[model samples]
Each structure stands twice: as structure tokens, then as C-alpha cells.
Target: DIGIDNLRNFYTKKDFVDLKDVKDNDTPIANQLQFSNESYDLISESKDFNKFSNFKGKKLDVFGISYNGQCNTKYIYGGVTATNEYLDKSRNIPINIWINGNHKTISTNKVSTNKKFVTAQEIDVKLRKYLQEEYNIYGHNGTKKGEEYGHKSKFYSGFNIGKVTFHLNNNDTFSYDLFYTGDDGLPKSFLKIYEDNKTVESEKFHLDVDISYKE
Candidate 1:
């Protein structure tokens, strides 16, 4: 009975990019680590579902954690969110990346529509370079100050689909928020809808090792 029928509703059949296809000798240190090949799942359910009926039953596959690296502490980086169908006709929804506690908009110019995946390599490079230049810490190596080896330090990378606002005839608006996290936890992603600035619906998706450091 372990067939597709028994599988979770959030399950996705899409496969992640193979390491060999994207990795090389000169690959950035953070991108050299082995990451799980499992793809992220999308979950969407709303009590006032008719407000955003188009998103109901829609599936999104996200690559939240491309690789994990360790220098003085463990860290993860690189990710992208994509969907097989168009999330919106305008295709202007912004995407953000949350590293540790720092959040930045990685995709602001253009959003993907029915695209298989988006590239986060530039952002990944920027993070790696920043760490090396600012902290003197090299990936998979000891920092200049000292060699601290421990997993106590937690690092996380979260890929968020910025709020999508829909205008109503009454001049009011509602918004939908979708975010995926590859963190050390049980639930991996979330979906929420806002109406009159109040949360109307929400859902959570679960997947192990979505965005976690690998040994």
C-alpha cells in the first residue's frame, strides 16, 4: 500500500539537480558539499479557499538547500523556488532568501512563470565571498582566528515567495504568503493567506533534511 495513493498530499515527483551536473573542481566551497536529492513540497489549504481558488491544489517544487559546508561551524547555502504552472500571470512575485537571521531579496526584477528552476549561484557566491573576506573563514577549513570544530552553531537558509496581493472589487486586498525552509525541524514549508490584514488560512508541509547541514 506504499503506492502514490498512500503518499502525502504534499509529495512532489520532481527530482533535484544532480551534483555532478553542477559541481566541479573550482566550484565554490559552499556548493561542494553533498545535499539531499529530495525536492521540497508545497502545501496549500484555506478555510476561505474561494478567495484564492486558483492556488488550491497547486504544487510547487523548491530547492531550498543546495549544499552544506563547514568551516568553524556548519552552514548551508544556495536554493531556488519554482513551479510547473504559472503562479500568477504578472509573474512579478518577489523571492527572498533568509540566511541565518539576514533576509534579502534575491529575486526582484523578474519572477519565474512555469520555469523549472531559478539560479541562486550569484547570491551563493556573494555569501561565500562575504564570509571569507569579512570573517576570514574559508569553507570546509578553519578560520584565521582559530579552528573551532562543532555543530552547536546552527545555520539555515530559507527561500520565501513574497506576499502575493490580489485586489478585490471593493478596493480592498488579500495576500498570500508561501515560504520554504531547509532548517533543522519537522515542518519544511508553510502557506498562509491574509485578509483585511488578518490570517484567514494556513498550512504546513513536512520533510526531513529540507535545509539542514550534512555530515
Candidate 2:
């Protein structure tokens, strides 16, 4: 009785009921419901409860990775930024990068290179976790709107909160950027990377993160 043939034969001999033969007893309540002036008045009064006003005096912290550089065969640049206004300012916020199991604090704006080379997968996982746990920001799965460069590259999407972009090269070296925004503040930062031992205009590149938060 449990086999497919037995089930099929049983169904074939059973009488089936057609939905068209059923009587319609349900009332069309939707047709009777209508918007009223009283509803409009209620909605107008509710406007006074502005939800965003709760974040007015909260402490805001904005931080992330911003870099522009050449790694192996690819020239890459972008940034991930994360911000949280509700977090207390007294909390310790560390800005650092992990390398081969070692953590090192990075300057807000500086030029440094890691010859030790890290993989894009490793960097992406660590950076995503760091941003989520530290800044209360989550990563998106794909590229942002109008982001043509990272369409084929491995990336983390962040809307309003942050974004992480990584361009992996054949030589195992990768370039990355992180961008973020939070609360009500205008934060603008830029970094310029020049080729090693060269100062030519063609050998220099830059990356920036600009965030505007409004009530």
C-alpha cells in the first residue's frame, strides 16, 4: 500500500471533487471596507511619533578599510565603511587588519604594504566578521548599483551600513576597500597610493570614502 504503484492505483479509483462544484459562502469583506476620514486623522496624528528622533543624541562611530594599490597583476582600489550611532563612545573601537593569524592596528590614513600576501577569501571572511561584530553592520552578497568593476570579483555588499570589495590576482595577492556610514554626520576621507620608488602621475592612485547621515 505504501508503494508508488499502489498509491497510483488507489488515486486512480478514488472520486475527486471539482473546485467549481463548491458553493461560495465567503463574504467579500474587502468590498465593504473603505478608507475613512477617521483613519486619515489617525494616520496624521501618528506622524508626530518620529521614530528616527530616538537616535538624535546617540554616540556615533564610523570606521572601515580604505585602500588603493597594485597587487601582482591587478590594480585595485575601493573601501568598506561601517557606522553605528547607538553604540556608546566609551566602547573601545580598534581599527586593525589581520595577517596570517596576527592582528595589527592600522592608521586612519597611511601607506603600508604586506609582502606576506593574503588570499581574497581569507580577507573577506575576516573583514565581514569584524564589521558585523564590531560595528553592527552586515555585508551584502553582491555588487552595489553602478558597481561595474566588481561584477566579476568577489565582494561583500553593504547598503547604508558598509561595503567590502576585493580584487584577487593570480599571484595570490589581493587589493581591498571598505566603506560605511552611520547616524547624522558627514565623514569624508581619502588616501593616495604611489608606486614604489616612483612619483609619476600615472603610477599614483587614490581611494576615498564619503558618508552623509541625515535625520
Candidate 3:
């Protein structure tokens, strides 16, 4: 009787969600790439306001590498760390775009938060502008309507709850979309790397850059 009672309690439902909605709940498959030679660490960008900025930008040290049909990509930007070491939330925050050992920049254009835009608002604008311009995707259709090529903005269902993976395919080539959600409750960044999607590759990533690029 004791064992049966315990079993009944274990089977009890904890919470309820509408079964009519839900999609792409599949767990992201286990990692498909390897990494090596990481020489840098992420320290916060603010060490109590007195922190300074590195004019040269952060060093994205390689962590490891391997190859499986899928190519591994890295995210190139996230704003404001606590140490103010590799990133500087001072003046204009620049997102560094690294590709094949080379790097470039994308600017946020705001020096600080204000009534014109709060932290979350600023992040949302900046991220959307960056992705739209890069992918030539314009308009709110990114949600209500899928991309021109059948790429969807929301995965399966749950409204804004799941990731909307965008895709571009032609000549047998494809690019997988990627993103980053700001730690300070800012809107998420939806970005991409254009190429054939790889399940395994020669490199993997440790840090996620908001706008990292690959060719």
C-alpha cells in the first residue's frame, strides 16, 4: 500500500499547458563540433565604473575543433560584462565580427540609456536592425508571415515562446540562423552565418557573439 501511494503521487501532473500549441520541442541535438587553443577568458566589462576599455577589442581565443558534416559557428557579440575587460560599455558599444581569424565591427550608436530608449528597447532595436539589414529581411512579417523562401519566424507554436529559425537555400547551399538573449533582460538577437549547415566541423565555440560572421 505504501509503494502504490507513492507511485500515485509521482504520476500527478504539476502544471498544465495547452496541448493544442507546441512545436520543435525536440532537445537541441548534442554538440557536433570540437574546439581548441583557447587563450582568453571573459571578464565583466564593468569593475565599478572606473573600468577601462580595450581599444583593440576582445581576443576571441579558439577553444577546440573537429569535423562532422556540420560546421560549427561562434556568436561574436554580447553587451556589457561585469569586469569591463574585453568589452567597454562606455561610449558606443561595438560588436566585433570575426571570421576565419579576421574581425570587424558593428555599432550600437548609443552611449548610454535614456528616455528615448530603455535598456531593453535599445537592445531590441539594435538587434533587429542588424539582422534585417544583414539578411535583407525587412518588415514585421518576420513573425506574422514567414520569410520569402518558406523560412518561418516562429518554430511550430506557442506564439513568441519558441525560436523562429530563418533559412536561405539555393544552389544546394544553406545557412543556419543563430541568436543571443541578453542577460540583463534585453530583447534577443537573431543573427546568422551563411554556408552549408554542418553537423560536425573543424571548429566549435565557447563564447557566443551577437553578430559573428562566416564566409
Candidate 4:
């Protein structure tokens, strides 16, 4: 009877979801990532407001790099602690990005129309204009530049729901710390949580920046 009861716990409530849906059989896999996991000692994250974010139709999962050979693991830009921590004290409250280390993105989120704390209507105008121009956010300082090639203006996603991972090539997979500097030259001095996709056949993700220039 006790074992059967334990099995019952494994079942997701018809209305309740497995917080960490696809990764673990139970709960959000907060402990799985080094950035947001329990091992981090103390995390200075957004204090939880009793907010019920109804991800009713949303799917969730974390991509893993298995040292396997059937399908080579690919890396995408994810695996970072994300929060809108750039809100200022007086006169202004611009949203900013926060991250600690390299991470991968795994979820796809829908556009939000009811963003609070900050005025959604006003914020959208700023974001829309921001996206119109090309932006290149980099790690630490983006001064050491190259002919930047990538899809820009896509910096936005669910805060704690998913991530965006970059897949490179065979056998080598990795992630990175990212920054978002508007054409206006403001990066919050931090990595903004941000983007893409297709149901194509898979490959491995390499951690080499000179990956394209490889012999």
C-alpha cells in the first residue's frame, strides 16, 4: 500500500504540471544546473511574489550534453541565472539582465501582454525601438570585436522557464555568458536573458570560437 501511494505521487495532477516538466520526473530541476541550483549557497534572485504565471499550454525541459555517440550533443546559449535586476531607484526603472556563468536555453515562450511592475505599454515602445536596430551583446567587454554574424534583436524570454542554446558541431558542445548592448551602448553591464528554432536532424555543439575558422 505504501509503495502504491508513492507511485501515485509520481502522477502529475490533471491541473498541476511537473514544475520541471521534461527533465526530472518531479519538481523543477533547479538543482540540476550549477547556476540556479541548491549548491549556489545564497542566490540573490527576484523575491518570489505570489504570482501565478499560468503556463497552461507551455512545454518545459532542459537540454543535456550526454557523452554519447548515437547523436552528438550540440550547444546552445542557455544555462544562466536570469532576472530583471536592472530596475533602478529613482527617475527610471529600466529592465536589465543578470547571469553568472555559461548556460543553455531550452524553452520557447509566448509573448507577454500583461507585464507588470514596469508599465507594459511604455516598455514595449522602448523594446520595439531597441529591436529595430542591430545589437551585439558580448561576454565581459565586446571591444575585441570581429565581423559579427548572428540573428540580433531577439533578446527576450521567460525569466525562469527556459533557455536558448547554440549548437556548433560534432563531439564538442558548450555554452557562454552573453550580454545585450543596444545600438545605444547600454548592456546593464550584464548578460540579458534572451532567442530560435526548427525540427531538423541534430548534431553536436562545440565550444570553440574559432570553430568556423577551423581547418
Candidate 5:
């Protein structure tokens, strides 16, 4: 749950079930944080998958957050869901979403399947809008969609996609390094967020780092 500038990021739309009134957010919601979608009512509020229900499966993930200060790269955010045997986008792609901060952390992450597509659960649901604004909020040396760098290189072409993710498949680029954790989960500094894979989209590639110092 995160937001920038006016900062908002939320959660608790009554925990979601049939919620529809998202006049300002909901992108498969979770650690992504575009507007809020109540963080998908805080992880589907539980039904089966648990662990955030692995995302609510089908292929949907858009992100962007700040709710505090410091962020760049256009700031809109990134989102994705794709799977339906994703392949260079024909349906769901959502890319270079937006939102980047400086010297801290706020990421969603994605990248892979640019060719392979056939099975893997056939993940696809396209929905994106990076119209390119501006961001490279400095983290390292971002090299994705250009136009600065804030994490979110686009995917999900859009058709009103809503839910997706169980393990992700084709065009694999599932990330959640929303850096910053505590409550015992670990991660505290280094502005953690690492994956940038070449081959791990299955068992894992990197991400796990977190950076926060709140309380």
C-alpha cells in the first residue's frame, strides 16, 4: 500500500468481495500500490491460497507508491497480469507503469517472457499505461523502459483486466520487492529490492530485500 505526492495508498475496502467502485485504484493490488484497491482488500482477505493468495491468479499486477515523499520516473506506476501463454503481447502486457523514489525504496518489478508462450497456465490479461512522463528516481542504473527509472517496464495491454497470479507463467516477470519490512519479516535497510533475473521466474530469481525504518 503506497502513494506519492499527495500520498494516500490504502487498504480495507471492507476487505473486498464484489467491490467495484474503484474510481482511483486497484491493480491486482498488493505491495504494488497504484491507488489502493484496498490492497486487494488486504490479500483477498483469505479464501485459500493465503500468502497473499499468491496474487489472486489470472494475471493482474500494476504498481506505484509513495505516501510519504521521494519518488520519480513519472510516478504513475507499473502493473501486470499476463500469462495466457504471453508472447510479445497480444492481449495482456501492462508495462513501464511508473513511480520511482530516491535513496530509499518503492518497487514492484517484472521482466522476462518476451518470446516463449505456449503453456505455463497461459497467463495473459494486458493492461498498462506508461505514456512516459518522467522518472529515474535513482536507485542504481535502471535500464528498462527508458525515460528515467522507477521500475515498471510495461505489460498488460488493458481490456479492463482485474485479477491474475498464482505462480505466473509465460513472459514471466513477477516481482514484489516493495522493499521495506519489519514486524519480524526482516529487511531493514540497503533499500532492498533485487531480482533482475535472467532465469529464475520459477523457483525464484532475486527479490527478498526490503528497506524501511518507520517506527
Candidate 6:
């Protein structure tokens, strides 16, 4: 499900089953974890990923919803699971994990990993705040909102992560494009740091692209 600026993102203690709390994995839950926009429950009345132990150390770019009550009342959102694997495997990738608006029509959507151990809060602030404020342009000219005048279509794909230029332990630059959809079922936009207009189509990169959860 998506996140809302208001209560849509809220969660309760019962909503989620902390694997730590399940002694026998007896919790009647689905292997897929999905959250709700109206309640704090971790597993929605409609779905659950009772397979809590399955995602112990794996980092998942689970889907979320953004309820702005606008042209789209709710839209798709993306965020990382913030697990140990994310700490290692996803530490050197770059891409936008926060998906919003109507993206079901776009087959090439994605959320890339980064070189740092970015938290959900940090990711949220960066995408929800900085990205929106900086989406000034859209065309190939790459101007602050100047692309609209140059391009003919209203659809825009990909992201420019130039503002995330903070230093990291890996010594890699922290800014680049969080652009269009990569191969199906892949997590974090690209497997490695994007190198500009590279071949993004690959059968090897598939992500669950479903489910929602906490760290």
C-alpha cells in the first residue's frame, strides 16, 4: 500500500508480527507483508506474509501507497526493507525507491539501492521533500522545469539524484538518475551504480514489487 502525508502511513503494534515475537512461526500470516493506509495494522485484513523468517536479512524494496487526494487519491510508493543485506548488497547502488503517482501503466519503473545504509525516514524525506521541490523541469534540456517546453509528451520517466551528494564510506558519488523501470521483479533500480543510458533491460533483475513492511 501507499503512504499518505496524514494517517495513511500510520501503523499499530498488532499490524505487524515481529519475527522475534513469533516462537513457532504460528502466526496466521501470509509470506507477503502488506500494510494499510487507514489502520496501523501490519497485515491488512486482506493479506499477510506470515513467512516472517523468510525475510530476516534480505532487503526488500516493498511497495507503498501515497494518498495525496489529488488527481490520484492513492499512488504506488517504493521503499527499502532496511535489512542486513541492504547494508551490504545495496550499499553501492543509486536509484529512486520512492514511487508515486499512476505507475501501473509504466512497465519500466524501479527503485535503486544506494551506497549508504539509508533509513526509511531519510529516504522518505529525501524523495517526498527534495525530489518534489526539485522536479522543476521535465524535458531533455534538463532545465528546472524547462523540459516541459522542449518535450512533446507529458509522461516523464526516471530520476535525477544529483542532490544526494553526501560523502559515504565507499567513496562513491551519491547522486545520479533513479530512472525508468528496469527488468521485472528486480529490487533497487539497478544492480550497480547506474552508468548513464546503459542497457537496463535484463531478465536477471526481478523484484517482488509487491508487499509492504518495516525494518
Give Cα distance to truth, residue 31, candidate 1, Å: 35
By lDDT rank, best first, the candidates go: 6, 1, 3, 5, 2, 4
In model 4, the Cα lDDT at residue 141 comes to 18
Which tens-of-lDDT digit does each residue in 132-203 have in candidate 5? 111222121223443332233211111111222223334444433232222333211111222111122332
Off by over 4 Å in 3: 1-91, 99-102, 108-117, 135-215
| Candidate 3 lDDT tens digits, 45-91 | 11222212321232222111111222332221222212122222333
Clashing pairs in 1: 182-211
Q: Kindly indicate the candidate among 3 and 5 with the higher TM-score.
A: 3
User: Per-candidate RMSD vs. true structure?
Assistant: 16.9, 26.7, 20.2, 20.9, 18.3, 14.8
How many residue pairs clash (N, CA or C atoms closer than 3 angstroms) in each of the candidate models, in the order given? 1, 12, 33, 23, 59, 35
True-structure lDDT of candidate 5: 0.24
Give the alpha carbon lDDT tens digit for every residue of 53-165 in model 6. Answer: 45333433332222222331222222224233322343222332322232221122223333233333233223332233233222232345433222232323133222333
Cα error, residue 190 of model 3, in Å, equals: 12
lDDT of 4 by residue, 1-215 (tens): 23222211211111111023322122243322212233221111111211102211233322211111123221222211112222232222222222223233221111121111222212222222221222222211123322243322222211111122333344333333222222333221121221111111111221111111111
- Most lDDT-accurate candidate: 6
Winner on lDDT (2 vs 6):
6
Better of 2 and 3 by lDDT: 3
> How does each model score on lDDT?
0.26, 0.23, 0.24, 0.21, 0.24, 0.27
Global local distance difference test of model 4? 0.21
Leading candidate by TM-score: 6
Q: lDDT of candidate 2 vs native?
A: 0.23
